[PDB]
A paper describes a structure:
V/A-ATPase is a motor protein that shares a common rotary catalytic mechanism with FoF1 ATP synthase. The V1 domain of Tth V/A-ATPase (A3B3D1F1) is an ATP-driven rotary motor where the central DF shaft rotates inside the hexameric A3B3 containing three catalytic sites, each composed of an AB dimer. When powered by ATP hydrolysis, the V1 domain rotates the central rotor against the A3B3 hexamer, composed of three catalytic AB dimers adopting different conformations (ABopen, ABsemi, and ABclosed). Here, we report the atomic models of 18 catalytic intermediates of the V1 domain of V/A-ATPase under different reaction conditions, determined by single particle cryo-EM.
The nucleotide-free V/A-ATPase (Nucfree) was used for cryo-grid preparation under different ATPase reaction conditions. We obtained structures of three rotational states of V/A-ATPase without nucleotide; state1 at 3.1 Å, state 2 at 4.7 Å, and state 3 at 6.3 Å resolution, with the DF shaft positions differing by 120° in each case. Using signal subtraction of the Vo domain, we achieved resolution of 3.0 and 4.1 Å for the V1 domain including half of the EG stalk in state1 and 2, allowing us to build atomic models of the V1 domain of these states. We identified a cryoEM structure of the original state1 from 39,902 particles at 3.1 Å resolution and another substate from 24,101 particles at 3.1 Å resolution. In the ABclosed and ABsemi dimers, densities for the catalytic side chains are well resolved, but no density corresponding to nucleotide was observed. Hereafter we refer to the structure as the Vnucfree. The structure of Vnucfree is very similar to the previously reported ADP inhibited structure. In addition, the Vnucfree is also similar to the structures under the saturated-ATP condition determined in this study, with the positions of the catalytic side chains almost identical in both cases. The Vnucfree in the ground state is activated by the binding of ATP to the catalytic sites.
Residue numbers in the entry:
A (entry chain B), E (entry chain A): 387 to 578
B (entry chain D): 360 to 474
C (entry chain G): 4 to 168
D (entry chain H): 1 to 104
F (entry chain F): 360 to 472
G (entry chain E): 360 to 470
Write the structure that this text describes.
C-alpha cells in the first residue's frame, strides 16, 4: 500500500523467492539508473553459482565480487561522518575510500539502457571493469600511504579512461582493458 | 502521475517540467527553514536561507492563494518565474541555462499591477 | 492505552511528530557544527598570536633581571600595584549566558610614569600585551567549549529520540 | 588577576598588575589554588601546562555552579625557547568534542 | 461510545450537518468551559453570513475574525516545537505568539455560565474584545522589534483590563472599551 | 454535576466555588510542569514554574492525603487557602478581590506543624 | 533449563558450570559498558572497563565466531579459559579458587 514490507503478501513472497532487487525512487531522483538499492537487496544463489563463475569467467571472479561488495559496505558505513562535517574535513584514507566508492557506483553500477553499447554488458566485461578498479585502488592506497596527496590522484588522466570503459564495444574491450591496465601500472611508477 | 506525457513543446510551453520541479524543491526548502528559524532565529541563518524563507512566504501568498481569478497557463508560468526570480540565479539547479536566460529577471508586477 | 481507532490515529500522529522533530534537531546540530568549525580557526589563530607574544615578553624579562640589576626587577615588582578591574560582561551564546572578559586595564596614569629602570621600564610594557593575548585566548576558548557542550547535548537528544521513543 | 607560574614571571605579571606565584608541583598548586579560587576576586587564573595539563580535574570540585574564574593551560618556560604544538592541541580537543579526529 | 469519534453515528452525522462543535475531555478536566476543541471544530456558514456582519456588527468584523483564526492556527503550529524543546528555547517573536494565544484562550474563548453577567455576551462585546486583543498584540510585536524584552511586556498592567473586560455589563461596556483602547496605546507610546 | 446546587452563600461558604476551581487550575498547571520537567530537567525551570511544581507536590501530600481523619468543611477550606497562599496573590485569577483580601495569607505551619 | 543435570563431574570436565556462569557474567557487563559509552563520552572511563570492552570484543570474535569448524568440548573450554585469563582475579569472583589457578595460565596467544 504505502511501501510497507510487512504486509502479508510481501512476507509470504520473501520466504520463497531467491533474490530481492530493491528498486528505489530516491536513487532515480539523483539520476542513478537502474535505481537498484545495493543495501536492501540480496540474493541466495551466489554460493551455488560459484563453480560456473570460476570456470566460465575467471578463477578469481568470486574474490573480486566480494572485494567490491566490501568497498561499497565500508563507504556506506562512513556516510554519517561525511554528512556531519563534509568530505574535505576527512582523513586521506577516508577520502580515498569515498572517492573509490563514488567511482564504483558511477562507472560500474550505473548503466544507460538507451546507449546502443552500454545497454548490454557481458560477464567478462564486468569482470574487467572490477579488476581495473581494484588495481587502481591498490595503487592509490600504496601512494597515499607513501606520501602523495589525494589531489594529485583525483586529477590523474587514467580516471577518464577507467570511467569511459563502459561505452567500448565487446570486441574492442580486451585491447582497451590490457592497455588500460598497463596505463594504471604506469601512473603508479610516477608516484613511486 | 501522467503529468510528464502532457507537457512540453507542442503541448504547453517547453519550460513547464523543469519549472515545476524547481518550484517543488524551493518550497520544500522554504518550509524546513521556516521551522528551524523558530529555535535559531533568523539572524543566525545564512543568506540563501533567508532567500528561501521569503520565497516560501511569497509563494503561498501569490501562487496558491489566487482567490476566484481565472488564470491562464501563461499567467501561471509568469507568476512562477517572477517568484523563482527571488532565489539567486545558479541556485535553480534543476532548470537548464537556456530557459534561465530567457525568462529570469522578471519581478512581481502583474499580480499587484492587476486583479 | 485504551485500544480505539481514535487512539490509533493519535499515536500515529505522535509518531509523525517524533520523526519531524528528529530531523529538525539534526538541522540545528548541523548549524552548530558550522559555527563551531568557524570558531576553531580563529581560536587557533589567537593561540598562535599568544605564542608569538609570549616569547617577546619572556625575552624582555630575561635580560632585564640579569643584564640589568638582579634587584631593580623585584623593586619594580613591589612598586606597581595589582589590577582588579576585570569585571566581565555576561554573553549570550545559543540560548546560554557565558562570561566575556572586559578587564579595564589602565596603563598610563599609574605610578612612576617615567624614571630610572633601563630594561625593566620596557619589559613591564611587554607583559601588558601578554595579558591582552591571554584574555583573547580565554574569551575565544570559553565560547568554543560552550558550543561544544551544546553540540554534544543535541546529539544526546537525537539519539534519545531515535533509539527509545 | 592571578597566575600560578614561576615566580620570575610572577614579578612580570605584577608589573602587569597581576599577582602570581608558584612552587613547581601539581599537588601544591592544586592545594593553594583552592584558596585562590575561594579568594577569587578576579575572573581568570592561568597555569602552565607542565604543572598539570588540565585545571578542570583540580578546580572542577570547588568551582561547581560558579563560572567566573576561567582556567586555561598556558605556555611554560621550556616553551619560552621551543614553542608549542598548537594544532595537536586543537585536534585532540575537537576529537573529544565532536567525537572524532577531523580536519586532516 | 467510549469517546470514540469514529463510531457510525458520529460519522453518519458529520456528512450531513452544517457546523460541528467538538467537546474534548482535557479541557473539561481543567475546569475550563465551554471546553470546545478548537482544532477539531468547523463551520460551513461563515462566508454566507458576512454581509449580515458587515451591516449589523462592524464593517471589518470578518477581518478581525480571520486574524484571530490565523493567530490560533500559528500558535497551534508552534506548539509542536514547544513540545520537543521546551517553551523557553523559542525566540521572543514566537514566545509572543504563545502568550497571545494563551490570552485569546483564557480571556476571549472562556465563558462563565454561572456568572450573572458573563453568561450572555452580545456580539458587539465580542467585537470589542477581539479588537483590543489584536491592538495589544500588534503593538507588542512592534515593541519587540525595538529591543524590548518579552518579560516586561507580560508585566504591563493593561493585561488586567484585557482579561477583566469580559465581566463588564453590556451597557457599561462601550466606555470601558474606549478607555481601554487609549490605555493600550499609551502602554507603549508613553514608554517610547 | 450537582455540586452547584448546594454550595455558596446561604450554604457552606461564599468562597467555596471559586476556591474549588482555582485549585483545579493550579493543580492542572503543576501536572503539566511535571510533564515538562520529564523532558528538559528540573534545573532549566523558571521561578513561577517551580512554585507550581511545589504547589502540586504539597497539594498531593497535605490536601489529598488525610488518612482516616474526619475534617469538617471549614478545616478543608482553611487548608485549601493555606495551600493557595503559596502562589503569588496576582495569579489567583479565578477568585474575586474581597475573598482574596479576607482569606489570603495563612501558612501551613499554623494549621499544623 | 536442564543444563545443571547434564554437565559437571563425571559427565564433562569439573569446572564446566562455574566457567559458564562467569563467562555469562563477564559478557553481561561488557555490553552495558558499551551501552553507556555509546551516549556519554568514553572519557568517563575506569581501568577495568577497558578490560571489559576488550573482553566483549575478543569474545564475540573468537568464542562466538567459529565459522565452519567443529570444536570438541575440551577446546571450547580451553578457548573460554583463555578469554577469561585476560581479566584479573577478583574480577573472576564466580569461579572457585582451585581451578582458578589450575586453568588460568594459558592466554589467547594460541589461535
Amino acid at each position: 500500500p504505502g511501501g510497507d514490507m510487512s504486509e502479508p503478501v510481501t512476507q509470504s513472497t520473501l520466504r520463497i523467492v531467491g533474490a530481492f532487487w530493491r528498486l528505489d525512487a530516491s536513487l532515480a531522483f539523483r539520476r542513478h539508473f537502474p535505481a537498484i538499492n545495493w543495501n536492501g537487496s540480496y540474493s541466495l544463489f551466489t554460493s551455488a553459482l560459484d563453480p560456473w563463475y570460476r570456470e566460465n569467467v575467471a578463477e578469481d571472479y568470486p574474490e573480486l565480487r566480494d572485494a567490491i561488495s566490501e568497498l561499497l559496505q565500508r563507504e556506506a558505513g562512513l556516510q554519517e561522518i561525511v554528512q556531519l562535517v563534509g568530505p574535505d574535513a576527512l582523513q586521506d584514507a577516508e577520502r580515498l575510500v569515498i572517492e573509490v566508492g563514488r567511482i564504483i557506483r558511477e562507472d560500474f553500477l550505473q548503466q544507460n539502457a538507451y546507449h546502443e553499447v552500454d545497454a548490454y554488458c557481458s560477464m567478462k566485461k564486468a569482470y574487467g571493469i572490477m579488476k581495473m578498479i581494484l588495481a587502481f585502488y591498490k595503487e592509490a592506497e600504496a601512494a597515499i600511504k607513501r606520501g602523495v596527496s589525494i589531489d594529485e590522484i583525483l586529477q590523474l588522466p587514467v580516471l577518464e579512461r577507467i570511467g569511459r570503459a563502459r561505452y567500448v564495444s565487446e570486441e574492442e574491450f580486451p585491447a582497451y582493458f590490457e592497455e588500460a591496465m598497463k596505463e594504471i601500472q604506469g601512473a603508479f611508477k610516477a608516484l613511486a | 502521475r501522467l503529468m510528464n506525457n502532457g507537457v512540453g513543446k507542442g503541448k504547453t510551453r517547453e519550460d513547464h517540467k523543469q519549472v515545476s520541479d524547481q518550484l517543488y524543491s524551493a518550497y520544500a526548502n522554504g518550509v524546513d527553514i521556516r521551522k528551524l528559524v523558530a529555535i535559531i532565529g533568523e539572524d543566525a541563518l545564512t543568506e540563501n536561507d533567508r532567500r528561501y524563507l521569503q520565497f516560501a512566504d511569497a509563494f503561498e501568498r501569490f501562487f496558491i492563494n489566487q482567490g476566484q481569478q481565472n488564470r491562464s497557463i501563461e499567467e501561471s508560468l509568469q507568476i512562477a518565474w517572477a517568484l523563482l526570480s527571488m532565489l539567486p540565479q545558479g541556485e535553480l539547479k534543476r532548470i537548464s541555462k537556456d530557459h534561465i536566460g530567457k525568462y529570469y529577471g522578471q519581478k512581481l508586477e502583474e499580480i499587484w499591477g492587476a486583479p | 492505552v485504551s485500544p480505539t481507532r481514535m487512539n490509533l490515529l493519535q499515536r500515529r500522529g505522535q509518531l509523525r511528530l517524533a520523526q519531524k522533530g528528529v530531523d529538525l534537531l539534526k538541522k540545528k546540530r548541523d548549524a552548530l557544527v558550522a559555527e563551531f568549525f568557524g570558531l576553531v580557526r580563529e581560536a587557533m589563530e589567537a593561540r598562535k598570536a599568544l605564542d608569538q607574544a609570549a616569547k617577546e615578553a619572556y625575552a624582555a624579562l630575561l635580560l632585564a633581571q640579569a643584564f640589568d640589576g638582579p634587584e631593580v626587577v623585584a623593586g619594580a615588582a613591589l612598586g606597581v600595584p595589582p589590577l582588579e578591574g576585570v569585571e566581565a560582561e555576561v554573553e549570550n551564546v545559543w540560548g546560554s549566558k557565558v562570561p566575556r572578559l572586559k578587564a579595564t586595564f589602565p596603563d598610563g596614569a599609574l605610578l612612576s610614569p617615567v624614571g630610572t629602570p633601563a630594561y625593566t621600564l620596557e619589559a613591564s610594557r611587554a607583559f601588558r600585551r601578554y595579558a591582552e593575548a591571554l584574555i583573547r585566548v580565554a574569551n575565544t576558548e570559553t565560547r568554543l567549549k560552550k558550543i561544544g557542550e551544546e553540540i554534544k547535548k543535541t546529539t544526546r537528544r537525537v539519539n534519545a529520540l531515535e533509539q527509545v521513543v | 588577576m592571578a597566575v600560578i607560574a614561576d615566580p620570575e614571571t610572577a614579578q612580570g605579571f605584577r608589573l602587569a598588575g597581576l599577582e602570581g606565584y608558584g612552587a613547581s608541583s601539581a599537588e601544591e598548586a592544586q592545594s593553594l589554588l583552592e584558596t585562590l579560587v575561594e579568594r577569587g576576586g578576579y575572573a581568570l587564573v592561568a597555569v602552565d601546562e607542565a604543572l598539570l595539563p588540565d585545571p578542570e580535574r583540580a578546580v572542577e570540585r570547588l568551582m561547581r555552579g560558579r563560572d567566573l574564574p576561567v582556567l586555561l593551560p598556558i605556555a611554560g618556560l621550556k616553551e619560552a625557547f621551543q614553542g608549542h604544538d598548537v594544532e595537536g592541541y586543537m585536534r585532540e580537543l575537537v576529537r573529544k568534542t565532536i567525537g572524532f579526529d577531523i580536519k586532516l
